């Protein structure tokens, strides 16, 4: 028990406010940029979409607003999808099913909530068989609003999620910024 004194700083920047200074900092920032950019340029959702908002997702697969040109492809199994899209309603009969699909996906996982029926119930908010948004079931990162949220707006929600992937800082975090 020899150590009895600490020399830790009282002013040290938060991770949202910190810029790199040392050669190890630029090294971990470059390595982090490689990892985050790999997480963006390939971007694989599971095609959970079930109702009105699923056709609007099939307009993101359409040749006018392409998703292949962004790197997006529907691996239709949650074991391989990075992310999930709750695109449509969530009744009380499907809430364990939605969770069991979300439980399976490998650990770097996000989820975007497409539509107004998928965040806060929506048009069917006061109904006996509905979940008032998948916020109760799955932890959601980006909310895309719109009752048929325009393919423009769904793509904008995807760009917002990719911006959240820019500042994930998986390797700067381990340095304890």
């Amino acid at each position: 028990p020899r150590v009895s004194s600490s020399s830790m700083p009282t002013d040290f920047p938060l991770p949202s406010q910190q810029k790199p200074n040392s050669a190890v900092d630029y090294t971990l920032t470059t390595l982090d940029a490689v990892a985050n950019w790999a997480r963006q340029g390939s971007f694989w959702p599971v095609t959970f979409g079930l109702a009105c908002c699923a056709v609007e997702m099939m307009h993101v697969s359409a040749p006018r607003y392409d998703q292949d040109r962004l790197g997006i492809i529907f691996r239709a199994s949650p074991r391989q999808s990075d992310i999930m899209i709750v695109a449509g309603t969530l009744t009380n009969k499907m809430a364990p099913v939605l969770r069991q699909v979300y439980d399976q996906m490998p650990e770097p996982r996000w989820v975007i909530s497409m539509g107004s029926c998928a965040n806060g119930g929506g048009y069917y908010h006061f109904s006996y068989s509905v979940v008032r948004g998948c916020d109760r079931i799955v932890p959601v990162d980006v909310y895309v609003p719109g009752c048929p949220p325009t393919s423009e707006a769904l793509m904008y929600g995807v760009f917002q999620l990719q911006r959240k992937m820019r500042n994930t800082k998986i390797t700067r975090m381990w340095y304890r910024k």
Binding site: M8, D11, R136
Partner: protein, 349 residues
């Protein structure tokens, strides 16, 4: 309908003077009135604690360290209940900032291995000194500080030494802090107790496993901790939270192996070679078994009789053998009357 189980009453006043009228029936969309800051809420104990805390609508303030873990807490409270804000232990403005509006505050910041940034002295007594100095400055009712079992200053293990030192420093700064000392904690995907025994290639140790400690379920620790959090009888009291019956490690591993129906490995090589091996594995980024956790393989459960148990807050902890089967379920592997009955089905079409 739902009901406020945690509260004795409707209208509760704090010690600081704030008056808290709980609204509505129990449940998700209701609000209790309390503002609570749980430090370390991404941890193993803290997830169950802020699950139980935001269940009835107490506003939970979560200072987080990384952005990717904390997502799993947002589902447990209503909209507006749980509030995430970033914090480093080094910036005093963030510790100053997180506890500023809290009616109650708990920390569980405790790290079992030394880092390049923090030793044991940095996280256990100096971080607790910074948090408790903030809580003294802001006049917060009900600061409660969790520390380890077997936490004394005379002990040779560094962990237990600086936990006892952290308890003494948070007694010096805030006199009205409840200090709570739980036993080893088994839960679902726990740290080193059952998740380690269910998957381990070798399960190597010292001591020939004969250390004595009893394990407590973690929803029991979180339930006892929230039942502390709300009554004012538990101010300035030290609590021992130890399970019903005392175990040894070979007994626990026999209990795990009889429910797995698989023979878990046993090595028991000498201490100095083991210590040098842990010293070698400290230089790797993912969290490895600590070398001062070797010293805690000798230290057994030393209970203070001058403390208050589960019996005070009206809880009976669940035993490990009744609950071994549920936590060890995924690692479980799995004659003539059948053959007299299978001679009537069709198998080739």
């Amino acid at each position: 309908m739902n009901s406020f189980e945690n509260l004795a009453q409707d209208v509760n006043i704090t010690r600081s003077g704030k008056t808290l009228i709980a609204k509505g029936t129990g449940g998700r969309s209701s609000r209790t009135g309390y503002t609570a800051t749980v430090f370390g809420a991404n941890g193993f104990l803290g997830s169950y604690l802020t699950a139980k805390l935001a269940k009835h609508g107490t506003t939970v303030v979560v200072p987080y360290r990384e952005e990717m873990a904390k997502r799993h807490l947002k589902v447990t409270g209503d909209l507006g209940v749980v509030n995430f804000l970033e914090m480093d232990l080094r910036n005093l403005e963030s510790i100053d900032e997180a506890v500023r509006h809290s009616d109650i505050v708990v920390n569980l910041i405790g790290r079992e291995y030394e880092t390049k940034n923090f030793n044991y002295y940095d996280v256990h007594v100096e971080g607790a000194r910074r948090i408790a100095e903030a809580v003294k400055k802001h006049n917060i009712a009900r600061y409660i500080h969790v520390s380890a079992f077997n936490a004394e200053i005379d002990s040779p293990s560094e962990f237990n030494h600086t936990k006892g030192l952290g308890e003494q420093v948070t007694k010096d700064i805030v006199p009205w802090a409840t200090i709570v000392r739980p036993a080893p904690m088994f839960g679902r995907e726990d740290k080193w107790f059952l998740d380690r025994m269910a998957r381990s290639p070798c399960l190597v140790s010292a001591n020939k496993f004969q250390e004595t400690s009893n394990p407590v379920h973690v929803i029991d620790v979180a339930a006892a901790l929230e039942r502390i959090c709300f009554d004012d009888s538990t101010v300035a009291q030290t609590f021992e939270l130890y399970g019903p019956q005392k175990f040894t490690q070979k007994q626990i591993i026999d209990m795990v192996s009889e429910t797995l129906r698989k023979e878990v490995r046993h090595i028991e090589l000498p201490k100095a070679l083991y210590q040098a091996y842990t010293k070698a594995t400290q230089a790797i980024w993912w969290p490895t078994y600590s070398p001062d956790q070797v010293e805690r393989q000798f230290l057994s459960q030393k209970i203070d009789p001058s403390a208050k148990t589960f019996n005070d807050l009206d809880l009976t902890p669940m035993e490990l053998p009744d609950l071994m089967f549920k936590l060890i379920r995924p690692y479980r592997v799995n004659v003539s009357q059948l053959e007299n009955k299978e001679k009537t089905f069709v198998h080739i079409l």
